[PDB]
Amino acid sequence: IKEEYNKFKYDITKQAIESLRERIPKRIIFFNNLVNVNSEPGSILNVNDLPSHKQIYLELEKIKTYASELIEIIGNIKLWIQLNVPRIEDGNNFGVGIQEEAIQELARVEESAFNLYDAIVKYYMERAKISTKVLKYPNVSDYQEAVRELDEKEWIHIKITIVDMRNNYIMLYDLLYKNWEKVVKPK
Amino acid sequence: EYDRGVNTFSPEGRLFQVEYALGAIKLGSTAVGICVNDGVILASERRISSTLIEKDSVEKLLSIDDHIGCAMSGLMADARTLIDYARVECNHYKFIYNENINIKSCVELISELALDFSRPFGVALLIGGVDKNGPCLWYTEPSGTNTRFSAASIGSAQEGAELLLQENYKKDMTFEQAEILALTVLRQVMEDKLSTSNVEICAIKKSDQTFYKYNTDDISRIIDVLP
Protein backbone atom coordinates (compact mmCIF):
# COMPACT_ATOMS: atom_id res chain seq x y z
CA ILE A 1 0.00 0.00 0.00
CA LYS A 2 2.97 2.23 0.86
CA GLU A 3 4.27 1.71 -2.69
CA GLU A 4 0.93 2.53 -4.37
CA TYR A 5 0.65 5.79 -2.40
CA ASN A 6 4.19 6.91 -3.29
CA LYS A 7 3.39 5.92 -6.90
CA PHE A 8 0.42 8.32 -6.75
CA LYS A 9 2.56 11.30 -5.73
CA TYR A 10 4.87 10.40 -8.61
CA ASP A 11 1.82 9.94 -10.89
CA ILE A 12 0.54 13.42 -10.00
CA THR A 13 3.84 15.18 -10.85
CA LYS A 14 3.93 13.56 -14.32
CA GLN A 15 0.36 14.58 -15.13
CA ALA A 16 0.94 18.18 -13.99
CA ILE A 17 3.98 18.79 -16.23
CA GLU A 18 2.27 17.10 -19.21
CA SER A 19 -0.78 19.33 -18.78
CA LEU A 20 1.20 22.56 -18.49
CA ARG A 21 3.60 21.85 -21.36
CA GLU A 22 1.16 20.33 -23.86
CA ARG A 23 -2.50 20.00 -22.82
CA ILE A 24 -2.98 23.62 -21.69
CA PRO A 25 -1.16 25.42 -24.63
CA LYS A 26 -3.06 23.25 -27.13
CA ARG A 27 -6.36 24.32 -25.60
CA ILE A 28 -5.31 27.99 -25.65
CA ILE A 29 -4.91 27.84 -29.43
CA PHE A 30 -8.05 25.66 -29.70
CA PHE A 31 -10.44 28.10 -28.04
CA ASN A 32 -8.64 31.00 -29.75
CA ASN A 33 -9.39 29.42 -33.14
CA LEU A 34 -13.09 29.71 -32.30
CA VAL A 35 -12.90 33.28 -30.96
CA ASN A 36 -9.85 35.03 -32.42
CA VAL A 37 -8.53 38.10 -30.58
CA ASN A 38 -7.90 39.88 -33.91
CA SER A 39 -11.63 40.06 -34.77
CA GLU A 40 -13.12 43.51 -35.31
CA PRO A 41 -15.64 44.83 -32.73
CA GLY A 42 -19.20 43.51 -33.01
CA SER A 43 -18.36 40.59 -35.30
CA ILE A 44 -18.30 38.09 -32.41
CA LEU A 45 -21.12 39.00 -29.96
CA ASN A 46 -24.04 39.29 -32.37
CA VAL A 47 -27.26 37.38 -33.16
CA ASN A 48 -27.15 37.29 -36.96
CA ASP A 49 -26.78 33.48 -37.17
CA LEU A 50 -29.83 32.74 -35.00
CA PRO A 51 -40.62 24.33 -30.12
CA SER A 52 -37.14 24.52 -28.61
CA HIS A 53 -34.15 26.28 -30.19
CA LYS A 54 -32.16 23.38 -31.64
CA GLN A 55 -29.30 25.73 -32.66
CA ILE A 56 -28.62 26.89 -29.08
CA TYR A 57 -28.84 23.23 -27.97
CA LEU A 58 -25.98 22.26 -30.30
CA GLU A 59 -23.85 25.14 -29.02
CA LEU A 60 -24.48 24.12 -25.41
CA GLU A 61 -23.45 20.53 -26.18
CA LYS A 62 -19.99 21.75 -27.26
CA ILE A 63 -19.84 23.93 -24.12
CA LYS A 64 -20.46 20.92 -21.86
CA THR A 65 -17.49 19.18 -23.51
CA TYR A 66 -15.36 22.30 -22.93
CA ALA A 67 -16.53 22.53 -19.32
CA SER A 68 -15.71 18.88 -18.57
CA GLU A 69 -12.16 19.06 -19.95
CA LEU A 70 -11.34 22.27 -18.04
CA ILE A 71 -12.37 21.08 -14.53
CA GLU A 72 -10.48 17.77 -14.85
CA ILE A 73 -7.17 19.42 -15.83
CA ILE A 74 -7.13 22.02 -13.04
CA GLY A 75 -8.11 19.52 -10.29
CA ASN A 76 -4.92 17.48 -10.47
CA ILE A 77 -2.94 20.71 -10.86
CA LYS A 78 -4.67 22.07 -7.75
CA LEU A 79 -3.83 18.92 -5.79
CA TRP A 80 -0.26 19.06 -7.17
CA ILE A 81 0.20 22.58 -5.78
CA GLN A 82 -1.18 21.28 -2.47
CA LEU A 83 1.37 18.44 -2.43
CA ASN A 84 4.28 20.90 -2.63
CA VAL A 85 3.49 23.17 0.38
CA PRO A 86 6.12 22.67 3.12
CA ARG A 87 5.47 22.13 6.82
CA ILE A 88 3.67 25.05 8.46
CA GLU A 89 6.19 27.27 10.23
CA ASP A 90 6.29 30.78 11.66
CA GLY A 91 8.19 33.16 9.41
CA ASN A 92 10.21 32.57 6.19
CA ASN A 93 7.03 31.17 4.64
CA PHE A 94 6.86 33.53 1.72
CA GLY A 95 6.62 30.59 -0.65
CA VAL A 96 3.42 29.27 0.91
CA GLY A 97 1.85 32.69 0.21
CA ILE A 98 2.77 32.33 -3.46
CA GLN A 99 1.40 28.78 -3.33
CA GLU A 100 -1.87 29.84 -1.67
CA GLU A 101 -2.49 32.57 -4.27
CA ALA A 102 -2.10 29.97 -7.03
CA ILE A 103 -4.51 27.54 -5.32
CA GLN A 104 -6.99 30.44 -4.87
CA GLU A 105 -7.00 31.33 -8.57
CA LEU A 106 -7.39 27.67 -9.60
CA ALA A 107 -10.45 27.27 -7.38
CA ARG A 108 -11.94 30.52 -8.77
CA VAL A 109 -11.67 29.36 -12.40
CA GLU A 110 -13.04 25.98 -11.28
CA GLU A 111 -16.09 27.69 -9.75
CA SER A 112 -16.61 29.55 -13.03
CA ALA A 113 -16.65 26.37 -15.13
CA PHE A 114 -18.68 24.63 -12.42
CA ASN A 115 -21.40 27.25 -12.60
CA LEU A 116 -22.04 26.40 -16.27
CA TYR A 117 -23.63 23.10 -15.24
CA ASP A 118 -26.10 24.92 -12.98
CA ALA A 119 -26.68 27.77 -15.47
CA ILE A 120 -27.78 25.45 -18.28
CA VAL A 121 -30.53 23.96 -16.07
CA LYS A 122 -31.73 27.49 -15.34
CA TYR A 123 -32.10 28.37 -19.04
CA TYR A 124 -34.59 25.60 -19.92
CA MET A 125 -36.61 26.02 -16.71
CA GLU A 126 -36.95 29.82 -17.03
CA ARG A 127 -37.72 29.78 -20.78
CA ALA A 128 -40.48 27.23 -20.35
CA LYS A 129 -42.42 29.20 -17.71
CA ILE A 130 -42.67 32.36 -19.86
CA SER A 131 -43.66 30.23 -22.91
CA THR A 132 -46.61 28.77 -20.95
CA LYS A 133 -47.86 32.32 -20.43
CA VAL A 134 -47.58 32.98 -24.19
CA LEU A 135 -49.86 30.00 -24.80
CA LYS A 136 -52.32 31.29 -22.18
CA TYR A 137 -52.07 34.98 -23.23
CA PRO A 138 -51.28 35.02 -26.98
CA ASN A 139 -51.86 38.75 -27.58
CA VAL A 140 -49.62 40.35 -24.91
CA SER A 141 -46.65 40.72 -27.27
CA ASP A 142 -44.04 41.40 -24.56
CA TYR A 143 -44.03 37.68 -23.64
CA GLN A 144 -42.99 36.78 -27.19
CA GLU A 145 -40.35 39.51 -27.14
CA ALA A 146 -39.19 38.07 -23.81
CA VAL A 147 -38.63 34.69 -25.49
CA ARG A 148 -36.64 36.39 -28.28
CA GLU A 149 -34.55 38.40 -25.81
CA LEU A 150 -33.83 35.29 -23.72
CA ASP A 151 -32.27 33.50 -26.73
CA GLU A 152 -30.25 36.63 -27.47
CA LYS A 153 -29.21 36.66 -23.80
CA GLU A 154 -28.20 32.98 -23.80
CA TRP A 155 -26.35 33.39 -27.10
CA ILE A 156 -24.24 36.21 -25.64
CA HIS A 157 -23.53 34.25 -22.43
CA ILE A 158 -22.28 31.26 -24.48
CA LYS A 159 -19.70 33.41 -26.28
CA ILE A 160 -18.68 35.34 -23.14
CA THR A 161 -18.11 31.98 -21.47
CA ILE A 162 -15.79 30.91 -24.32
CA VAL A 163 -13.76 34.15 -24.26
CA ASP A 164 -13.44 33.96 -20.45
CA MET A 165 -12.40 30.31 -20.89
CA ARG A 166 -9.72 31.29 -23.45
CA ASN A 167 -8.44 34.21 -21.37
CA ASN A 168 -8.27 32.11 -18.21
CA TYR A 169 -6.22 29.37 -19.94
CA ILE A 170 -3.46 31.75 -20.97
CA MET A 171 -3.62 33.57 -17.64
CA LEU A 172 -3.20 30.29 -15.76
CA TYR A 173 -0.15 29.19 -17.76
CA ASP A 174 1.47 32.64 -17.63
CA LEU A 175 0.87 32.94 -13.85
CA LEU A 176 2.42 29.56 -12.95
CA TYR A 177 5.35 30.11 -15.36
CA LYS A 178 6.51 33.36 -13.68
CA ASN A 179 6.49 31.89 -10.14
CA TRP A 180 7.65 28.44 -11.26
CA GLU A 181 10.70 28.24 -8.97
CA LYS A 182 8.49 28.73 -5.89
CA VAL A 183 5.89 26.34 -7.35
CA VAL A 184 8.37 23.44 -7.56
CA LYS A 185 10.44 23.97 -4.42
CA PRO A 186 8.55 24.11 -1.11
CA LYS A 187 10.56 26.84 0.67
CA GLU B 1 -0.04 37.44 21.69
CA TYR B 2 2.83 39.42 23.26
CA ASP B 3 6.00 39.12 21.17
CA ARG B 4 7.27 42.65 20.41
CA GLY B 5 9.40 43.31 23.48
CA VAL B 6 12.26 41.15 24.69
CA ASN B 7 11.67 41.69 28.42
CA THR B 8 7.88 41.43 28.51
CA PHE B 9 6.22 39.23 31.08
CA SER B 10 3.06 37.14 30.87
CA PRO B 11 -0.19 37.28 32.86
CA GLU B 12 0.54 33.72 33.98
CA GLY B 13 3.96 34.72 35.30
CA ARG B 14 6.31 33.62 32.55
CA LEU B 15 8.85 34.95 30.10
CA PHE B 16 8.38 35.08 26.34
CA GLN B 17 11.61 35.77 24.48
CA VAL B 18 13.42 33.16 26.56
CA GLU B 19 10.76 30.52 25.90
CA TYR B 20 11.20 30.92 22.14
CA ALA B 21 14.78 29.68 22.43
CA LEU B 22 13.63 26.75 24.58
CA GLY B 23 12.47 24.99 21.42
CA ALA B 24 15.47 26.08 19.37
CA ILE B 25 17.79 23.80 21.35
CA LYS B 26 15.73 20.78 20.29
CA LEU B 27 17.04 20.89 16.72
CA GLY B 28 20.78 20.33 17.09
CA SER B 29 22.65 17.06 17.19
CA THR B 30 22.01 14.74 20.09
CA ALA B 31 24.48 14.35 22.93
CA VAL B 32 24.68 12.49 26.22
CA GLY B 33 26.98 12.73 29.21
CA ILE B 34 27.29 10.40 32.18
CA CYS B 35 28.79 11.40 35.53
CA VAL B 36 30.16 8.31 37.21
CA ASN B 37 32.03 7.92 40.50
CA ASP B 38 35.35 7.77 38.60
CA GLY B 39 34.91 10.57 36.06
CA VAL B 40 32.74 12.05 33.33
CA ILE B 41 32.13 10.55 29.88
CA LEU B 42 30.49 12.47 27.02
CA ALA B 43 29.14 11.46 23.63
CA SER B 44 27.69 13.08 20.52
CA GLU B 45 26.82 12.52 16.86
CA ARG B 46 28.64 13.79 13.79
CA ARG B 47 26.29 14.91 11.01
CA ILE B 48 28.90 14.84 8.25
CA SER B 49 26.32 13.65 5.65
CA SER B 50 28.18 15.45 2.89
CA THR B 51 31.41 13.51 2.42
CA LEU B 52 33.23 16.60 1.08
CA ILE B 53 33.76 17.90 4.61
CA GLU B 54 37.12 17.58 6.36
CA LYS B 55 35.32 15.76 9.26
CA ASP B 56 37.71 17.30 11.82
CA SER B 57 36.83 20.98 11.49
CA VAL B 58 33.28 20.36 12.72
CA GLU B 59 33.29 19.21 16.34
CA LYS B 60 30.56 18.89 18.94
CA LEU B 61 32.76 18.36 22.01
CA LEU B 62 35.01 21.37 22.47
CA SER B 63 37.05 22.11 25.57
CA ILE B 64 36.58 24.86 28.11
CA ASP B 65 40.01 24.09 29.58
CA ASP B 66 42.17 21.02 30.08
CA HIS B 67 40.02 19.95 33.04
CA ILE B 68 36.54 20.87 31.78
CA GLY B 69 35.00 19.53 28.58
CA CYS B 70 31.53 20.33 27.28
CA ALA B 71 28.95 19.59 24.61
CA MET B 72 26.90 21.82 22.33
CA SER B 73 23.40 22.07 20.91
CA GLY B 74 21.15 24.57 19.20
CA LEU B 75 22.74 27.44 17.33
CA MET B 76 26.28 26.30 16.56
CA ALA B 77 27.25 29.85 15.62
CA ASP B 78 26.27 31.15 19.05
CA ALA B 79 27.57 28.15 20.98
CA ARG B 80 31.12 29.04 20.02
CA THR B 81 30.72 32.51 21.50
CA LEU B 82 29.86 31.14 24.93
CA ILE B 83 32.62 28.55 24.73
CA ASP B 84 35.10 31.26 23.76
CA TYR B 85 33.92 33.25 26.74
CA ALA B 86 34.23 30.25 29.02
CA ARG B 87 37.73 29.66 27.68
CA VAL B 88 38.62 33.19 28.77
CA GLU B 89 37.17 33.35 32.29
CA CYS B 90 38.30 29.84 33.18
CA ASN B 91 41.77 30.68 31.97
CA HIS B 92 41.55 34.10 33.60
CA TYR B 93 40.75 32.30 36.83
CA LYS B 94 43.94 30.28 36.59
CA PHE B 95 45.93 33.49 36.28
CA ILE B 96 44.41 34.94 39.44
CA TYR B 97 44.09 31.81 41.57
CA ASN B 98 46.57 29.02 40.98
CA GLU B 99 43.97 26.27 41.24
CA ASN B 100 41.58 25.21 38.50
CA ILE B 101 38.09 26.72 38.56
CA ASN B 102 35.17 24.83 40.02
CA ILE B 103 32.33 23.86 37.70
CA LYS B 104 29.81 25.34 40.14
CA SER B 105 31.68 28.62 39.79
CA CYS B 106 32.09 28.18 36.03
CA VAL B 107 28.55 27.21 35.07
CA GLU B 108 27.25 30.15 37.09
CA LEU B 109 29.29 32.49 34.91
CA ILE B 110 28.38 30.71 31.70
CA SER B 111 24.73 31.32 32.61
CA GLU B 112 25.09 34.98 33.49
CA LEU B 113 26.14 35.72 29.91
CA ALA B 114 22.75 34.39 28.80
CA LEU B 115 21.27 37.29 30.80
CA ASP B 116 22.11 40.10 28.33
CA PHE B 117 19.26 42.30 29.70
CA SER B 118 20.74 41.77 21.90
CA ARG B 119 19.03 38.38 22.21
CA PRO B 120 19.28 35.33 24.48
CA PHE B 121 21.72 32.66 23.42
CA GLY B 122 19.84 29.71 22.00
CA VAL B 123 22.25 27.04 23.23
CA ALA B 124 22.24 24.33 25.88
CA LEU B 125 25.47 22.83 27.20
CA LEU B 126 26.65 19.75 29.08
CA ILE B 127 29.64 21.15 30.95
CA GLY B 128 31.48 18.42 32.82
CA GLY B 129 34.76 18.14 34.67
CA VAL B 130 36.65 16.75 37.64
CA ASP B 131 37.76 20.12 39.13
CA LYS B 132 37.46 19.22 42.86
CA ASN B 133 35.18 17.10 45.06
CA GLY B 134 35.22 14.34 42.47
CA PRO B 135 33.60 14.71 39.06
CA CYS B 136 30.56 16.85 38.38
CA LEU B 137 28.30 17.22 35.35
CA TRP B 138 26.15 20.27 34.78
CA TYR B 139 23.53 21.14 32.20
CA THR B 140 22.69 24.76 31.46
CA GLU B 141 19.79 26.25 29.50
CA PRO B 142 19.13 29.62 27.86
CA SER B 143 16.82 30.51 30.75
CA GLY B 144 19.73 30.37 33.18
CA THR B 145 18.66 27.32 35.19
CA ASN B 146 21.84 25.47 36.13
CA THR B 147 20.89 21.98 37.28
CA ARG B 148 23.62 19.50 38.17
CA PHE B 149 22.82 16.26 36.37
CA SER B 150 24.12 12.75 36.88
CA ALA B 151 23.26 11.68 33.33
CA ALA B 152 21.39 13.88 30.86
CA SER B 153 20.94 14.37 27.15
CA ILE B 154 20.59 17.38 24.85
CA GLY B 155 19.70 17.44 21.17
CA SER B 156 16.92 16.74 18.72
CA ALA B 157 16.62 13.20 20.10
CA GLN B 158 17.03 14.09 23.77
CA GLU B 159 13.58 12.75 24.63
CA GLY B 160 14.35 9.11 23.87
CA ALA B 161 17.74 9.18 25.59
CA GLU B 162 16.15 10.62 28.73
CA LEU B 163 14.08 7.56 29.64
CA LEU B 164 16.89 5.22 28.56
CA LEU B 165 19.32 6.61 31.11
CA GLN B 166 16.68 6.36 33.84
CA GLU B 167 16.46 2.61 33.23
CA ASN B 168 20.22 2.14 32.89
CA TYR B 169 22.10 4.45 35.27
CA LYS B 170 23.68 2.74 38.26
CA LYS B 171 25.82 4.52 40.84
CA ASP B 172 28.54 1.83 40.94
CA MET B 173 29.51 2.00 37.25
CA THR B 174 33.14 2.44 36.20
CA PHE B 175 34.51 4.05 33.04
CA GLU B 176 34.28 0.94 30.85
CA GLN B 177 30.85 0.26 32.37
CA ALA B 178 29.43 3.62 31.31
CA GLU B 179 31.41 3.73 28.04
CA ILE B 180 29.20 0.98 26.67
CA LEU B 181 26.26 2.69 28.32
CA ALA B 182 27.19 5.95 26.60
CA LEU B 183 26.80 4.14 23.27
CA THR B 184 23.71 2.01 23.82
CA VAL B 185 21.68 5.17 24.26
CA LEU B 186 23.22 6.47 21.05
CA ARG B 187 22.46 3.22 19.24
CA GLN B 188 18.75 3.67 19.96
CA VAL B 189 18.32 7.22 18.67
CA MET B 190 20.44 7.19 15.52
CA GLU B 191 19.52 7.36 11.84
CA ASP B 192 22.80 5.64 10.94
CA LYS B 193 25.16 2.98 12.31
CA LEU B 194 27.54 3.56 15.21
CA SER B 195 30.65 3.56 13.07
CA THR B 196 34.10 4.82 14.01
CA SER B 197 33.40 8.29 12.60
CA ASN B 198 29.94 9.39 13.71
CA VAL B 199 30.71 9.06 17.42
CA GLU B 200 33.10 11.51 19.10
CA ILE B 201 33.30 10.45 22.77
CA CYS B 202 35.86 11.90 25.18
CA ALA B 203 36.31 11.57 28.92
CA ILE B 204 37.95 13.24 31.90
CA LYS B 205 39.53 10.75 34.28
CA LYS B 206 39.81 11.50 37.98
CA SER B 207 43.42 10.32 38.11
CA ASP B 208 45.17 12.60 35.62
CA GLN B 209 42.42 15.24 36.12
CA THR B 210 42.61 16.08 32.40
CA PHE B 211 40.44 15.35 29.40
CA TYR B 212 41.48 13.11 26.53
CA LYS B 213 39.62 12.86 23.25
CA TYR B 214 38.97 9.25 22.28
CA ASN B 215 40.39 9.03 18.76
CA THR B 216 39.17 6.87 15.87
CA ASP B 217 41.37 3.97 16.94
CA ASP B 218 40.24 3.86 20.57
CA ILE B 219 36.52 4.14 19.81
CA SER B 220 36.63 1.13 17.47
CA ARG B 221 37.41 -1.12 20.44
CA ILE B 222 34.38 0.23 22.31
CA ILE B 223 31.71 0.38 19.58
CA ASP B 224 32.13 -3.33 18.79
CA VAL B 225 31.20 -4.71 22.20
CA LEU B 226 27.49 -4.87 21.06
CA PRO B 227 25.50 -3.85 24.20
Binding site: G91 | A21, G23, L52, I53, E54, A77, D78, T81, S118
Partner: protein, 227 residues
Protein backbone atom coordinates in the same frame (compact mmCIF):
# COMPACT_ATOMS: atom_id res chain seq x y z
CA UNK C 1 17.14 40.96 15.53
CA UNK C 2 14.93 38.71 17.66
CA UNK C 3 13.82 35.09 17.59
CA UNK C 4 10.77 33.45 16.05
CA UNK C 5 7.88 31.83 17.95
CA UNK C 6 8.99 28.35 16.90
CA UNK C 7 12.74 28.82 17.29
CA UNK C 8 14.26 30.18 14.08
CA UNK C 9 15.70 33.62 13.25
CA UNK C 10 13.87 35.73 10.70
CA UNK C 11 16.82 38.10 10.33
CA UNK C 12 19.34 35.35 9.60
CA UNK C 13 17.34 33.01 7.36
CA UNK C 14 16.41 36.03 5.25
CA UNK C 15 20.07 36.97 4.95
CA UNK C 16 21.06 33.37 4.23
CA UNK C 17 18.55 33.37 1.40
CA UNK C 18 19.95 36.67 0.13
CA UNK C 19 23.18 34.97 -0.90
CA UNK C 20 21.26 32.58 -3.15
CA UNK C 21 20.68 35.43 -5.62
CA UNK C 22 24.35 35.85 -6.47
CA UNK C 23 27.08 34.60 -8.75
CA UNK C 24 28.22 31.05 -8.14
CA UNK C 25 31.72 30.28 -6.84
CA UNK C 26 33.33 26.84 -6.50
CA UNK C 27 36.55 25.85 -4.73
CA UNK C 28 38.47 22.58 -4.76
CA UNK C 29 41.28 21.26 -2.53
CA UNK C 30 44.21 19.20 -3.76
CA UNK C 31 47.53 17.84 -2.53
CA UNK C 32 49.64 21.01 -2.30
CA UNK C 33 47.51 23.61 -4.09
CA UNK C 34 43.89 24.69 -4.28
CA UNK C 35 42.42 26.02 -7.49
CA UNK C 36 39.36 28.25 -7.17
CA UNK C 37 36.59 29.01 -9.61
CA UNK C 38 33.92 31.66 -10.03
CA UNK C 39 31.32 32.45 -12.68
CA UNK C 40 30.40 36.10 -13.26
CA UNK C 41 28.72 38.07 -16.03
CA UNK C 42 29.43 41.45 -17.64
CA UNK C 43 27.87 43.75 -20.22
CA UNK C 44 29.69 43.46 -23.58
CA UNK C 45 31.86 46.29 -24.94
CA UNK C 46 31.77 47.96 -21.47
CA UNK C 47 33.22 47.27 -17.96
CA UNK C 48 36.70 46.07 -18.93
CA UNK C 49 38.10 44.36 -15.77
CA UNK C 50 34.95 44.20 -13.50
CA UNK C 51 37.35 45.76 -10.90
CA UNK C 52 38.41 42.18 -9.94
CA UNK C 53 34.99 41.47 -8.50
CA UNK C 54 36.03 38.02 -7.26
CA UNK C 55 39.20 36.20 -6.12
CA UNK C 56 40.31 38.78 -3.60
CA UNK C 57 43.65 38.40 -1.85
CA UNK C 58 44.21 38.81 1.86
CA UNK C 59 47.88 37.99 2.21
CA UNK C 60 50.59 36.38 0.13
CA UNK C 61 48.99 33.00 0.77
CA UNK C 62 45.25 33.53 1.40
CA UNK C 63 42.83 33.87 -1.49
CA UNK C 64 39.15 34.63 -1.02
CA UNK C 65 36.29 34.27 -3.48
CA UNK C 66 33.05 35.46 -1.94
CA UNK C 67 29.53 35.14 -3.31
CA UNK C 68 26.43 37.22 -2.84
CA UNK C 69 26.19 40.96 -2.25
CA UNK C 70 29.01 42.52 -4.24
CA UNK C 71 28.87 45.76 -2.28
CA UNK C 72 28.94 44.06 1.10
CA UNK C 73 32.24 42.34 0.43
CA UNK C 74 34.33 45.51 0.60
CA UNK C 75 33.48 46.05 4.24
CA UNK C 76 34.01 42.35 4.88
CA UNK C 77 37.35 42.22 3.09
CA UNK C 78 38.65 45.51 4.51
CA UNK C 79 37.75 44.34 7.98
CA UNK C 80 39.62 41.10 7.15
CA UNK C 81 42.73 42.38 5.36
CA UNK C 82 43.26 44.64 8.34
CA UNK C 83 43.01 41.68 10.68
CA UNK C 84 45.20 39.56 8.45
CA UNK C 85 47.93 42.18 8.71
CA UNK C 86 47.32 42.94 12.38
CA UNK C 87 47.94 39.28 13.20
CA UNK C 88 51.23 39.48 11.34
CA UNK C 89 52.18 42.47 13.45
CA UNK C 90 51.40 40.84 16.79
CA UNK C 91 52.52 37.25 16.21
CA UNK C 92 55.21 37.87 13.53
CA UNK C 93 53.85 35.17 11.30
CA UNK C 94 51.70 35.30 8.17
CA UNK C 95 48.12 34.70 9.28
CA UNK C 96 47.04 31.09 8.79
CA UNK C 97 43.82 30.31 6.97
CA UNK C 98 42.50 28.83 10.22
CA UNK C 99 42.68 32.22 11.88
CA UNK C 100 41.23 34.26 9.01
CA UNK C 101 38.22 31.96 8.69
CA UNK C 102 37.79 32.07 12.44
CA UNK C 103 37.81 35.85 12.17
CA UNK C 104 35.44 36.22 9.23
CA UNK C 105 33.01 33.91 10.98
CA UNK C 106 33.29 36.00 14.13
CA UNK C 107 32.63 39.16 12.13
CA UNK C 108 29.34 37.91 10.72
CA UNK C 109 28.35 36.47 14.09
CA UNK C 110 29.06 39.82 15.75
CA UNK C 111 26.55 41.41 13.37
CA UNK C 112 23.54 39.17 13.97
CA UNK C 113 23.80 38.96 17.76
CA UNK C 114 23.93 42.73 18.15
CA UNK C 115 20.83 44.84 17.65
CA UNK C 116 20.15 47.51 15.07
CA UNK C 117 22.71 46.11 12.62
CA UNK C 118 21.91 44.42 9.34
CA UNK C 119 23.59 41.01 8.99
CA UNK C 120 26.30 40.50 6.42
CA UNK C 121 24.38 39.14 3.47
CA UNK C 122 27.43 37.37 2.06
CA UNK C 123 28.67 33.77 2.10
CA UNK C 124 32.35 33.28 1.39
CA UNK C 125 35.02 30.63 1.13
CA UNK C 126 38.66 31.13 2.07
CA UNK C 127 41.45 29.01 0.65
CA UNK C 128 44.90 29.40 2.15
CA UNK C 129 47.55 27.67 4.19
CA UNK C 130 47.78 26.51 7.78
CA UNK C 131 50.90 26.87 9.93
CA UNK C 132 52.38 23.68 8.56
CA UNK C 133 52.58 23.20 4.79
CA UNK C 134 48.91 22.30 4.44
CA UNK C 135 45.89 23.66 2.56
CA UNK C 136 42.38 23.67 4.02
CA UNK C 137 39.61 25.44 2.11
CA UNK C 138 37.14 26.96 4.54
CA UNK C 139 33.62 28.21 3.92
CA UNK C 140 31.60 30.68 5.99
CA UNK C 141 27.88 31.41 5.89
CA UNK C 142 26.07 34.62 6.96
CA UNK C 143 24.74 32.82 10.02
CA UNK C 144 28.29 32.53 11.37
CA UNK C 145 28.86 28.80 10.91
CA UNK C 146 32.07 27.66 9.22
CA UNK C 147 33.68 24.35 8.35
CA UNK C 148 36.52 23.12 6.21
CA UNK C 149 35.91 21.29 2.96
CA UNK C 150 37.63 19.29 0.26
CA UNK C 151 35.40 21.00 -2.34
CA UNK C 152 32.55 23.42 -1.82
CA UNK C 153 30.32 25.74 -3.79
CA UNK C 154 28.10 28.70 -2.93
CA UNK C 155 25.83 31.01 -4.90
CA UNK C 156 22.90 30.61 -7.28
CA UNK C 157 21.76 26.96 -7.27
CA UNK C 158 24.73 25.77 -5.27
CA UNK C 159 23.03 22.47 -4.43
CA UNK C 160 23.08 21.05 -7.96
CA UNK C 161 26.74 21.95 -8.40
CA UNK C 162 27.83 20.68 -4.99
CA UNK C 163 25.98 17.43 -5.63
CA UNK C 164 27.88 16.82 -8.87
CA UNK C 165 31.13 17.56 -7.09
CA UNK C 166 30.29 14.99 -4.42
CA UNK C 167 30.45 12.13 -6.91
CA UNK C 168 33.54 12.50 -9.11
CA UNK C 169 35.81 14.06 -6.46
CA UNK C 170 39.06 12.11 -6.50
CA UNK C 171 41.48 12.21 -3.58
CA UNK C 172 44.67 13.69 -5.06
CA UNK C 173 44.71 15.26 -8.50
CA UNK C 174 47.02 16.88 -11.03
CA UNK C 175 47.22 20.65 -11.58
CA UNK C 176 45.36 20.33 -14.85
CA UNK C 177 43.13 17.52 -13.56
CA UNK C 178 42.06 19.59 -10.55
CA UNK C 179 41.29 22.48 -12.89
CA UNK C 180 39.18 20.23 -15.15
CA UNK C 181 37.15 19.14 -12.14
CA UNK C 182 36.52 22.76 -11.23
CA UNK C 183 35.92 23.52 -14.89
CA UNK C 184 33.33 20.74 -14.99
CA UNK C 185 31.24 22.98 -12.70
CA UNK C 186 29.75 25.19 -15.43
CA UNK C 187 26.39 23.69 -14.47
CA UNK C 188 25.17 27.15 -13.48
CA UNK C 189 25.83 29.35 -16.52
CA UNK C 190 24.44 28.05 -19.81
CA UNK C 191 26.62 27.68 -22.99
CA UNK C 192 29.89 27.81 -20.92
CA UNK C 193 31.12 31.20 -22.07
CA UNK C 194 34.86 31.77 -21.66
CA UNK C 195 34.10 35.39 -20.75
CA UNK C 196 32.21 34.20 -17.64
CA UNK C 197 34.37 31.68 -15.76
CA UNK C 198 37.43 32.89 -13.86
CA UNK C 199 39.86 30.54 -12.15
CA UNK C 200 43.02 31.05 -10.12
CA UNK C 201 45.57 28.43 -9.16
CA UNK C 202 46.77 29.03 -5.60
CA UNK C 203 50.06 27.15 -5.43
CA UNK C 204 53.35 27.04 -3.47
CA UNK C 205 52.23 29.86 -1.16
CA UNK C 206 52.00 32.26 -4.18
CA UNK C 207 48.64 33.06 -5.81
CA UNK C 208 48.35 33.52 -9.59
CA UNK C 209 45.53 33.79 -12.11
CA UNK C 210 44.78 31.64 -15.16
CA UNK C 211 44.90 33.23 -18.60
CA UNK C 212 41.92 32.90 -20.97
CA UNK C 213 44.22 31.18 -23.51
CA UNK C 214 44.42 27.91 -21.58
CA UNK C 215 40.77 28.38 -20.59
CA UNK C 216 39.58 27.85 -24.17
CA UNK C 217 41.78 24.76 -24.39
CA UNK C 218 39.92 23.29 -21.40
CA UNK C 219 36.42 24.76 -21.71
CA UNK C 220 36.02 23.38 -25.24
CA UNK C 221 36.77 19.80 -24.19
CA UNK C 222 33.60 19.65 -22.05
CA UNK C 223 31.32 19.99 -25.09
CA UNK C 224 33.03 16.96 -26.65
CA UNK C 225 32.49 14.86 -23.51
CA UNK C 226 28.69 14.86 -23.20
CA UNK C 227 28.42 12.56 -26.22
Amino acid sequence: TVFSPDGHLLQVEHALEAVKKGGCAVAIKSSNFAVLAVEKKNIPKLQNPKTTEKLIKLDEHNCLAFAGLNADARVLVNKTRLECQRYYLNMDEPAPVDYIAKYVAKVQQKFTHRGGVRPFGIATLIAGFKNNKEICIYQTEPSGIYAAWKAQAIGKNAKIVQEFLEKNYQENMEQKDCIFLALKAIFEVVELSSKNVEVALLTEKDLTFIEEQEINSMVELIDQERT
